Write a structure and sequence with these properties.
homodimer; mainly beta; Jelly Rolls; seven-stranded antiparallel beta sheet; five-stranded antiparallel beta sheet; binds a molecule of 8 linked components (NDG-BMA-MAN-NAG-GAL-MAN-NAG-GAL); binds a molecule of 8 linked components (NAG-BMA-MAN-NAG-GAL-MAN-NAG-GAL); complex(lectin/saccharide); complex(lectin-saccharide); COMPLEX(LECTIN-SACCHARIDE) complex; dimeric; bovine galectin-1
């Protein structure tokens, strides 16, 4: 269905999760899901080039016990299809910080109040090239 | 056994898996398992500092339907407690090539004849700092 699925991550607050991968030449959208498990996501990171009505927009949302939360759309879109990008993610009690390329970075509330991230999955027109723990 | 567990890898012949991590100060052993799943491992890579009657010896083996194969032991042991070590693994239908530090490398047969690897697992006194797909 999608890409890489990693579990047992022991991502404690402060630590950084760096993910590098190449986006398809004709990418429609790609995603990175972080959380406790697939149904309890503290972060559903979804850049949309041309999908679900959104064009060149990063849509973020959470999932709690299977129920999707309120979406949060971002304006800056530093991803050119057919290139290699790197996203860096860290969190704390209050919220997570997503560092995108070109110096852009935004925050997303930690609606789940997760003290550790043990799950991550990738999907869409994206191919993981590296996963780093810092 | 077990720690970071990654599924849906879809690693194919020619592509190499690279893992970097730091070994524990009083590490008795650590392991990396590659296979089609938890019970069918084309490679159980296990560097033992002091475990199972072995002192500083790399024990490799396979597992088919849960049955451990015939152990193959290695001479070199470029591991030191506290230090960060990197290993790279490539494969084809014949055998996997474990490339260790300074140009040293050894081969282990692809006993199960897997064409692709979808499961990776890590365990023991090892801290994964990065996993790259090349
Ligand atoms: C003809 C003859 O006698 N030949 C002997 C061999 O018998 C002997 O074989 C090895 O023996 C060791 C030690 O076993 C001891 O404990 C037994 C009971 O627990 C006992 O019955 C044994 O006799 C032996 O006892 C020792 O006996 C000696 C002499 O009697 C005592 O010493 C004497 O003591 C005196 C004072 O009392 C005095 O000091 C004398 O000077 C002194 O000599 C000693 O004190 C006494 N100790 C004890 C506790 O009783 C075995 O460990 C070893 O077995 C392993 O290897 C063989 C194959 O070589 C396997 O068949 C066996 O299953 C073991 O394999 C390991 O299996 C595990 C489990 O699967 C593997 O780990 C897993 O691996 C997976 C990956 O594949 C995965 O990683 C997983 O996570 C792991 O858990 C290991 O990798 C396996 N390792 C290997 C290599 O296969 C031998 O049987 C030898 C050497 O001792 O000498 C002669 O050749
Ligand atoms: C300028 C611009 O870029 N604006 C965009 C908006 O376009 C965009 O809105 C989206 O619009 C979609 C299309 O609607 C049209 O098509 C249907 C189907 O035929 C029509 O029935 C409907 O009437 C619309 O028709 C259009 O009408 C206009 C006006 O008549 C036509 O234009 C006119 O045309 C004439 C000539 O005839 C002339 O040229 C005029 O000048 C011109 O104006 C136009 O041509 C015509 N189009 C067609 C084809 O006929 C909607 O489908 C889309 O819907 C989403 O948003 C609404 C609320 O806004 C929701 O109610 C709806 O359910 C849906 O929500 C999305 O739900 C999905 C899941 O179901 C969400 O995705 C999930 O998200 C999760 C994370 O939270 C996970 O990631 C999961 O995997 C993922 O699947 C998704 O996020 C939801 N989207 C939103 C926004 O919440 C939408 O409204 C908006 C919003 O994207 O952005 C603007 O920038």
């Amino acid at each position: 269905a999608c890409g890489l699925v990693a579990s047992n991550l022991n991502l404690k607050p402060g630590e950084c999760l760096r993910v590098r991968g190449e986006v398809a030449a004709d990418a429609k959208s790609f995603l990175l899901n972080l959380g406790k498990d697939d149904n309890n996501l503290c972060l559903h990171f979804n850049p949309r080039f041309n999908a679900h009505g959104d064009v060149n927009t990063i849509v973020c949302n959470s999932k709690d016990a299977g129920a999707w939360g309120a979406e949060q759309r971002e304006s800056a879109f530093p991803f050119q299809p057919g290139s290699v990008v790197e996203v860096c993610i860290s969190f704390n009690q209050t919220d997570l910080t997503i560092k995108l390329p070109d110096g852009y970075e935004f925050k997303f509330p930690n609606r789940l109040n997760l003290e550790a991230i043990n799950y991550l999955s990738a999907g869409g027109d994206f191919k993981i090239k590296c996963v780093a723990f810092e």
